Amino acid sequence: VLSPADKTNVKAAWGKVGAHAGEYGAEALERMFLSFPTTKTYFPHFDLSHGSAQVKGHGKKVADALTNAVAHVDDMPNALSALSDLHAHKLRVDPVNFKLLSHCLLVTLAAHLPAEFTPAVHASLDKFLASVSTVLTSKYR
Amino acid sequence: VLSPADKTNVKAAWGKVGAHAGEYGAEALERMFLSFPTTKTYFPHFDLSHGSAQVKGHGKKVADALTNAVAHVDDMPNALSALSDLHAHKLRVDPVNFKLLSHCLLVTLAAHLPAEFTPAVHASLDKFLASVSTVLTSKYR
Amino acid sequence: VHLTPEEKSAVTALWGKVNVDEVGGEALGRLLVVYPWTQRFFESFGDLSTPDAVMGNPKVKAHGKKVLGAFSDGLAHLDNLKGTFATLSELHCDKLHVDPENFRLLGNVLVCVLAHHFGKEFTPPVQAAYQKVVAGVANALAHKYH
Amino acid sequence: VHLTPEEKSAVTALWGKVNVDEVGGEALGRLLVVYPWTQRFFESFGDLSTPDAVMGNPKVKAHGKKVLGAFSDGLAHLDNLKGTFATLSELHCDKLHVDPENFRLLGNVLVCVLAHHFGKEFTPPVQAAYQKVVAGVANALAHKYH
Numbered sequence: 001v002l003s004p005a006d007k008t009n010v011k012a013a014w015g016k017v018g019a020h021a022g023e024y025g026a027e028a029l030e031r032m033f034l035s036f037p038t039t040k041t042y043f044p045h046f047d048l049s050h051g052s053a054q055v056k057g058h059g060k061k062v063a064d065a066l067t068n069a070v071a072h073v074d075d076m077p078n079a080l081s082a083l084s085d086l087h088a089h090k091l092r093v094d095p096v097n098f099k100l101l102s103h104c105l106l107v108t109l110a111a112h113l114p115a116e117f118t119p120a121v122h123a124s125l126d127k128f129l130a131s132v133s134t135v136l137t138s139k140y141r
Numbered sequence: 142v143l144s145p146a147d148k149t150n151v152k153a154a155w156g157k158v159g160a161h162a163g164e165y166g167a168e169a170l171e172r173m174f175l176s177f178p179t180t181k182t183y184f185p186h187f188d189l190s191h192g193s194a195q196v197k198g199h200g201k202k203v204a205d206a207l208t209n210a211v212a213h214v215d216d217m218p219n220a221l222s223a224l225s226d227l228h229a230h231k232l233r234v235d236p237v238n239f240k241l242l243s244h245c246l247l248v249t250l251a252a253h254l255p256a257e258f259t260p261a262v263h264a265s266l267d268k269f270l271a272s273v274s275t276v277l278t279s280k281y282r
Numbered sequence: 283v284h285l286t287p288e289e290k291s292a293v294t295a296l297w298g299k300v301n302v303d304e305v306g307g308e309a310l311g312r313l314l315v316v317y318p319w320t321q322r323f324f325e326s327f328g329d330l331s332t333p334d335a336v337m338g339n340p341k342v343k344a345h346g347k348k349v350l351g352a353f354s355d356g357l358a359h360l361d362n363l364k365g366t367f368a369t370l371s372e373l374h375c376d377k378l379h380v381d382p383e384n385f386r387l388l389g390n391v392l393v394c395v396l397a398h399h400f401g402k403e404f405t406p407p408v409q410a411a412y413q414k415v416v417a418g419v420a421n422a423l424a425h426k427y428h
Numbered sequence: 429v430h431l432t433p434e435e436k437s438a439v440t441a442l443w444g445k446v447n448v449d450e451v452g453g454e455a456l457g458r459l460l461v462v463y464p465w466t467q468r469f470f471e472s473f474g475d476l477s478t479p480d481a482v483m484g485n486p487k488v489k490a491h492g493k494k495v496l497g498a499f500s501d502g503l504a505h506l507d508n509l510k511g512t513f514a515t516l517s518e519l520h521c522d523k524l525h526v527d528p529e530n531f532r533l534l535g536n537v538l539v540c541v542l543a544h545h546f547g548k549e550f551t552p553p554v555q556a557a558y559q560k561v562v563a564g565v566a567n568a569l570a571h572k573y574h
């Protein structure tokens with residue numbers, strides 16, 4: 001449950017993550033595949049080679065979706081409704097993996113936005129990604 | 142999102158538990174202490190031996206909270222508000238432990254409800270306990 | 283992990299009373315019903331749209347017996363779970379592309395079935411032994427992922 | 429469980445330029461801020477009311493130094509982390525009552541801190557090596573619990 005402060009911090013931090021959507025999203029994905037190999041079981045249909053077009057494009061798809069959620073942080077359920085249905089009825093990624101990607105996103109943000117990644121912002125981002133994950137898994141069963 | 146159907150077979154399963162709720166709650170606790178020793182770190186002030194009156198006592202409170210949530214299943218956040226506040230701001234039990242006790246509660250119900258514990262009811266009970274767990278950790282941060 | 287002597291005996295003792303085929307179908311079925319996203323790996327099994335459909339699906343039952351049969355054979359090597367399941371670990375990763383988290387879920391579902399089936403005899407201490415076993419098998423099955 | 433020769437090399441290479449003392453206080457501080465329930469063990473550290481207060485608390489830094497110090501020494505014993513923290517594991521269980529999950533959370537906070545601190549240098553491959561290390565340490569510290 002995102003406090004007005006969390007929302008403020010999230011909007012502010014996610015600021016620079018804008019133009020670097022595909023790059024940061026791609027980096028977050030690569031970090032996950034290398035750090036948590038089991039997550040690659042969801043992408044056997046992808047060339048997971050460093051720098052592949054598939055990983056760069058999916059990275060952008062993920063980052064853009066988060067940019068959206070940030071933009072409509074006060075009505076996240078509806079904004080992510082289509083994405084929620086997709087992960088719930090088709091992709092069916094085990095819930096545990098959202099925490100893994102969320103962590104790699106935080107790591108990506110930390111390595112790219114040193115000025116913005118303060119302890120308070122860190123905590124808000126973490127809560128934010130956990131919220132998004134909750135929405136994305138809210139229709140699983 | 143507990144469906145109107147999850148609630149119904151939950152109320153049905155719990156209705157069958159009836160006056161055994163307390164006993165089942167203590168049993169679920171013992172099951173957890175034996176299956177996942179790390180959960181014992183939260184009860185240094187308790188004697189955790191089988192038959193422990195402290196465990197039995199706690200078990201009844203845990204059962205009562207569950208019986209109450211079932212009575213107000215359509216609005217559990219309120220029914221559990223006081224308790225959620227207690228685990229979040231004082232007890233501060235790491236969220237991971239709620240799935241451990243939940244699993245053990247399921248095992249306890251399964252071991253006592255031959256006829257009631259059908260696949261559908263097993264599914265509804267799991268969602269119910271995950272829901273209770275979500276409510277009890279909802280104010281952690 | 284390593285089970286103690288008084289736990290290895292509880293596991294074997296209890297497993298001797300089990301009808302593998304019966305438990306396997308039951309466990310796999312409940313897995314697909316309780317955690318429906320696991321149905322992502324069995325689109326070939328056909329209809330799994332409802333609890334009754336899943337529990338009555340012949341392909342789910344048949345696969346349940348193979349899974350619990352390999353699980354059963356593994357109980358003969360509770361001290362070498364990783365080496366005993368090394369081959370199936372590679373299969374699930376390289377050919378089946380199955381997230382190891384799934385083994386954890388099946389393990390908990392299996393525990394619920396054993397309790398449902400054995401009732402009182404599935405004591406806290408017996409459950410403890412089995413929780414160690416399922417965790418071991420899951421860890422063994424996930425060991426060869428890369 | 430297993431880091432490759434190159435992975436352990438990357439870990440020590442990057443760590444060699446880490447002031448175990450200073451990073452220690454930073455990791456523990458963020459832990460208490462991001463996952464505030466972890467503060468349950470430090471009601472005697474004083475003021476922990478704000479992120480700034482937590483981050484600048486000498487007791488927190490002092491503990492962070494102590495905690496990361498054992499971590500660093502463990503980096504010198506990667507082929508056997510269990511034995512390395514065996515006695516430390518027993519202490520955290522029997523006298524401190526620290527839920528091992530706290531070790532996992534600190535591990536991920538530490539990875540984030542390393543990323544924040546080293547930026548670009550904390551590449552994906554380097555992160556992967558450290559993830560193995562923090563998992564290894566956590567598991568080792570939890571191994572003696574009973």
Ligand code: HEM
Binds near residue numbers: 042043065091093097
């Ligand atoms: C922060 C949480 C996540 C976000 C915001 C997210 C977002 C998305 C988006 C935008 C798509 C593209 C849908 C489209 O084409 O319209 C997608 C697809 C997908 N997601 Fe998620 N996702 C999340 C987490 C995960 C996780 C944890 C996994 C697995 C480890 C995962 C696996 C997939 C897969 C397999 C696809 C299909 C990609 C393809 O075939 O092109 N997602 N996700």
Ligand code: HEM
Binds near residue numbers: 199203206224
């Ligand atoms: C299924 C969810 C749970 C429910 C419904 C629940 C319910 C309760 C209730 C009603 C109380 C006492 C209320 C009071 O006296 O004010 C309590 C106390 C407590 N709970 Fe929770 N609890 C749950 C899960 C957990 C878990 C997973 C742990 C840790 C493994 C935990 C640890 C504690 C502790 C340490 C106490 C203090 C007991 C004492 O000192 O008497 N609880 N819980």
Ligand code: HEM
Binds near residue numbers: 323345
């Ligand atoms: C105790 C854990 C498990 C064991 C020991 C195990 C064992 C096996 C075995 C021996 C087979 C080969 C069947 C044959 O070809 O005759 C198999 C196949 C398979 N397993 Fe696992 N399995 C386990 C858990 C799981 C879980 C939890 C999932 C997924 C949620 C899974 C998904 C699969 C799939 C998709 C196949 C292929 C079935 C087919 O299309 O023929 N397994 N497993």
Ligand code: HEM
Binds near residue numbers: 494499519520534
């Ligand atoms: C990387 C993991 C960690 C390592 C290697 C570690 C190491 C240590 C060491 C070396 C001590 C001193 C023991 C002695 O010689 O008396 C200690 C004390 C302690 N640790 Fe851990 N620890 C870790 C994580 C944590 C975490 C995350 C918490 C809790 C959130 C925790 C809570 C404590 C407490 C409360 C003490 C006692 C402090 C005091 O008495 O001043 N530890 N730890």
Ligand SMILES: *[C@@H](CC(=O)c1ccc(OCCCC(=O)O)c(Cl)c1)c1ncc[nH]1
Binds near residue numbers: 002126237282
């Ligand atoms: C609000 C977000 C919120 O209040 C919240 C963020 C993060 C955690 O971390 C717990 C980790 C352990 C676990 O997930 O099991 C918690 Cl408990 C709460 C929010 N929730 C949904 C939508 N927005």
Ligand SMILES: *[C@H](CC(=O)c1ccc(OCCCC(=O)O)c(Cl)c1)c1ncc[nH]1
Binds near residue numbers: 095143144271272275
């Ligand atoms: C909704 C209930 C619901 O549809 C649901 C129940 C349980 C899970 O389990 C996964 C949890 C994993 C974790 O703890 O991170 C899911 Cl994904 C969905 C509901 N009712 C009250 C609150 N939410």
